[model samples]
Target chain A: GMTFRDTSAIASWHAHVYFDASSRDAAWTLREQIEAHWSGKLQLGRFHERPVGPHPMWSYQLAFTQEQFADLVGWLTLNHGALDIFLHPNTGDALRDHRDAAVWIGHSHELVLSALN
Target chain B: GMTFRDTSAIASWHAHVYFDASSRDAAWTLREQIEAHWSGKLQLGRFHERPVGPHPMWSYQLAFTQEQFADLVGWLTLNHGALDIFLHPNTGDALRDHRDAAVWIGHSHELVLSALN
Candidate 1:
């Protein structure tokens, strides 16, 4: 019999996008559009578009494969409108005190070339 | 030769703000101040006013015009008491990682310029 010690699931990619809008409807429309165009699997997390004011912008989490991420960025670059998209690296470390997640340790240059080309 | 490889829209000015505070009472005060002064198009995004701890602080992002960003920073500095400010620059590339968003960004420089002028 083999004994296995389970740690945790390593995340392949993590990203966050922030946009500015005057209303919740506008933010929702953009979120739907991005999800619609996503080529790989995606799971949505906390959708916070309205803060404490009238002008409400929102953020959500989407997970995808490396190939899918590139496709998404290319897609975003093409349809850039009122929102701004940023790629944030996710680190599983719990003690990190920054707004963004951990650093991306993969070889992104090579991986990007393989995907975008 | 007619060609069509549609490109996405590029972002000219994308900005957000984060602040530190004492409690919700403190946070509410801060929020009121920020919303009162935003001009030249502004919106709120992903407000996390409460997190998992004491000494509660919230992060709300704002997208301001270049001139408004300047004005806000100025107002922030003149009224600097508790919250600190920073400027973030967005650079697009897989080669660099780790919050490489700001090259020459700071929240206090222009205010210094205005005060001295």
Candidate 2:
């Protein structure tokens, strides 16, 4: 089993990631593209096929390490991806509202040290 | 109205999720893999184009259910994929600063229960 820590600084390092293309239409378009192309591979997991109506947002949440963060930054910069990454300052709250509108995809402890320092 | 619980245990269960490899070229390669294979059936929501910059990093945020989390971990192990997963202990802060820098793909509820527990 993994050890659980209740530290604040460590907790506050999480982030919510959202990729908005400035247009819901664009986002929807891309979703359609992904589904069409990767449905077979996507059979591996649970995905909302219908999603919700109005279909203007595609969202996900995840934590990252410092090295991973750098790699992400590199990818974003190199690829021209724009994301709305929110940073949490407290561990308690971050956990409480993990799925309140936003989400928690994963984390990067290694990235946290490198990115925040 | 749906019941909203401010349980600290539940709150601090969110994280960010990003998928990036060593080279921008690798991500670009992975992207092409998904696109070429699953582009036609993806008509559920929104997405992006040009994805921003150079050609690296493919990311998504998703809260995991217990089964989903297991599925992911299993897949990662079986497929030999890499992931950046984090766990925060505070509820307030996690939501407040969900996405620090890297993109958040999605959160896992059941995934949290099983994988986390």
Candidate 3:
């Protein structure tokens, strides 16, 4: 039987917004919109023009807390446009969180698991 | 190029909580938690013990509005222990909504696309 994971284990969340050359502008637009809307509530990450971390595509990150999880994710869900987002909780285990404990909005992508853990 | 869909087009959302014989109890427990926490805010759908609609697994639905999106989804993300959730915006098109415009938590499953319009 699979073990049950408590929600209490999550300290925060990370949303990786994936984009390519063509979608960079769209991604940038989305980034600006989020910054404008979320403002101080959300922590925006670096704009990685190349594949970084376990992410297979060029991406940036949006970090928020358990308190902000719903609002940010829901907002992203509706406004993510043609973008694909990979979101996971910060449960200490970098590998399992990305590889297993995760969710996706739009299309699912294969993450570079070797880069994590 | 992929077309950009406006989030305003989404009238509401439907989240199918997938469960089976083994996970039925766990699903029920989760259902109770959702109903208890959300109380009057979210609409609880039928407990389908058999595969229904596009779902290939025994599942139930949770219907909510854009207003309730953040809270419910975030709650599900943290509290959903071992359950697979299928969430999609109700943008009128049954086929595209379920097949194309959708998100998954936990694991992804092959939906019965033919069942939808």
Candidate 4:
């Protein structure tokens, strides 16, 4: 079976934390922890509540290098209590990437694909 | 200073991996690795090369729950290699969220906020 794994050629990986009004507090809590522990370890984005560019719901973005991708995933596996996570690669093809080469840590949401077109 | 961390109210988080014609191969390689190891660990979006909506460059999106947020960040920190990552929180206000409460693991790009308006 052709599994999903980044080969030596992979440059980086990205992770998006999708939060909402109900779980805003939990989201912030995690954000603080990352800054304290992984401050210089990873790249962080801002907190968004409303639908910005093409995203449908309120969400946050995180980016990491190939060396840290696995470690971060393991840590998140144990820490992510009730939040939903969306993971994907940076392949160039936006439409196919989301639809085909996508993975989920929690319940996935249907994005507004129409916006892309 | 007011740090950027997910509070109790934050529901989830989102991460976007932005790349272009220069880094498409790296993105795909990472995607495959994630599917192999963290197949059931996190959620993933598509590989987008073109600007779907407000995003200025080509990027991929990832969503995760609060509990897994920190862990994921840690894991990605080591594995992202030379890729550019955009991290953000789901605060509700799209425009302000990206502009005010945003963080970047790598080089951050200016989004098409005008499209958001």
Candidate 5:
């Protein structure tokens, strides 16, 4: 378990916000909201329309430092409508990171766990 | 639609970690982890074995400021195993706050929505 007493191992964080064919519009809109809100503070990764590695749905990745984590994740928490999000810490341990330090925004989806294992 | 326009209205946040009679021990284990890790940084509400308010499961509450939202929620993401958690911002709009400005830790649940409505 990644306790609060030890987060120094975490370099940054990744929030892979998910969407699909029907929810593309909402997903894009949310991306724009994300860009507008988090402009220079984070790196918005490629919007993968197809399922990527561990992700089981269309997703886009938002990489931000621990400094901006709460504000940004919390923002996504409120605004992600009808969309599921997969969030995990980049603690240099892919397996444990996803398996242990993962958070979800809407509904938790089945990730291709073997993708990390 | 709440979109982090400034969480000033959200003086704090609440995470109702859920468990059942079978998962009660695991739930208590999680609470201890939270208390030891968060220590004076946040407030832990009673250990509710019975469902309360709008929550649909046996649950307990954790109140924390915006400052600790990320670290704490992130930790819970990693720590809460086989448990479901419902987190919402404590803005004045209770309905919208629960329906809109919310984050789920593991699996999202069907809340007692009528309780809020």
Candidate 6:
């Protein structure tokens, strides 16, 4: 009978780096940089040209453990340049996680709330 | 018989500055700067504590003529700091306008598509 929050021992975080055709090349460059420098700490996803799942823009998702969140975010803060990042904690409540517990290194958009519901 | 794209003569652009409780002071500071420096070119809206209408986060909207777009965006580019900005053209087709034509100085979020439909 474990609820979402009950999985605290396994909680993780996600960060999505969003880009469009104009920034696709740069996104990949940054991807390569991450693979070269922090590949052991970060897990990267494929890039999407259009919005997929609940995302509102083209993006690549990165997952990391709680211990690695700060360093990764700190680096992206200065390096993201022109790209938007959606960062959130995986606390089981998707809506609250995105709406209330979210952090933005750049701009924030309305997520598909109904999809999460 | 004006379709969404026929109103080129009257087209306008909008920019939304998104912030949360943590950065309210910085947001207001920027608000004052815009009001004092470019009030003549920009039209400001009330700040909301939560997402309203089609917006997905706490934000203040600024409207401007097409001619002011470049200058305003340029200034914000250097000064926006940690705030995220959602910039879009006001063509009649809301979906295409945001998904295809939108620009962001920061991160972008999924907007409420059904609202526009």
**Model 6, TM vs. native:** 0.48
The lDDT of each candidate is 0.37, 0.30, 0.82, 0.63, 0.81, 0.68
RMSD per prediction, one decimal? 18.3, 19.9, 3.7, 15.0, 2.4, 14.2
Q: Name the runs in model 1 displaced over 4 angstroms.
A: A1-10, A20-23, A51-57, A94-117, B1-117
Model 6 docking tier (incorrect/acceptable/medium/high): incorrect
Candidate 3 runs further than 4 Å off: A1-6, B1-13, B19-42, B64-72, B78-82, B89-101, B109-116
For model 1, residues A1-117, the per-residue Cα lDDT tens digits are: 112112122234444444545534554665677666553466655676543221123455566544444344434433434344433323353222012122111111111112211
lDDT of 2 by residue, A1-117 (tens): 212222222332333333444534433443343345345332112222332221223343334443233223222212212333333323444333232223222321112222222
Docking class of 2: incorrect
The model with the greater lDDT, 2 or 5, is: 5
For residues B1-117, what per-residue lDDT tens digits would candidate 3 score against the true structure? 344344677888899999999899999998877787767578888999999889999999999987777556666776777888999888888887776667888777889888885
Per-candidate interface DockQ score: 0.03, 0.07, 0.34, 0.03, 0.50, 0.06
TM-scores for every predicted model: 0.34, 0.23, 0.75, 0.48, 0.89, 0.48
| Cα lDDT tens digits for candidate 4, A1-117 | 233233443456667777889988877776666667686568888888876544666778778865665446545533555566666555566665454434444445666777656
> Which of 2 and 3 is ahead in DockQ?
3
Taking the tens digit of each residue's C-alpha lDDT, what string does model 5 give over A52-87?
889899999999998988888767766677788888
For model 4, residues B1-117, the per-residue Cα lDDT tens digits are 233332544556777777788878887777776666566667888889898776777878878876766556545533665566666666577765555434444444676778764
- Which whole-number lDDT from 0 to 100 does residue A35 have in model 3? 81
The full ranking of all candidates by lDDT, starting with the best, is 3, 5, 6, 4, 1, 2
Per-prediction share of native contacts kept: 0.02, 0.13, 0.31, 0.00, 0.46, 0.12
Model 6 reproduced share of reference interface contacts? 0.12
Native contact fraction of candidate 2?
Answer: 0.13
Off by over 4 Å in 4: A1-117, B1-6
- Report the first chain's TM-score for all candidates: 0.52, 0.31, 0.97, 0.82, 0.91, 0.85
What C-alpha lDDT does candidate 3 achieve relative to the native structure?
A: 0.82
Location of the lowest summed lDDT over 10 successive residues in candidate 3 chain B: B1-10
- CA shift at A101, candidate 2, in angstroms? 31
Residue-wise C-alpha lDDT for candidate 3, range A6-104, written one tens digit per residue:
567788889999999989999998888878788899899989999987998889999999788756666677678778899988888888788766788
**Distance from true position, residue B12, model 4, in Å?**
0.9
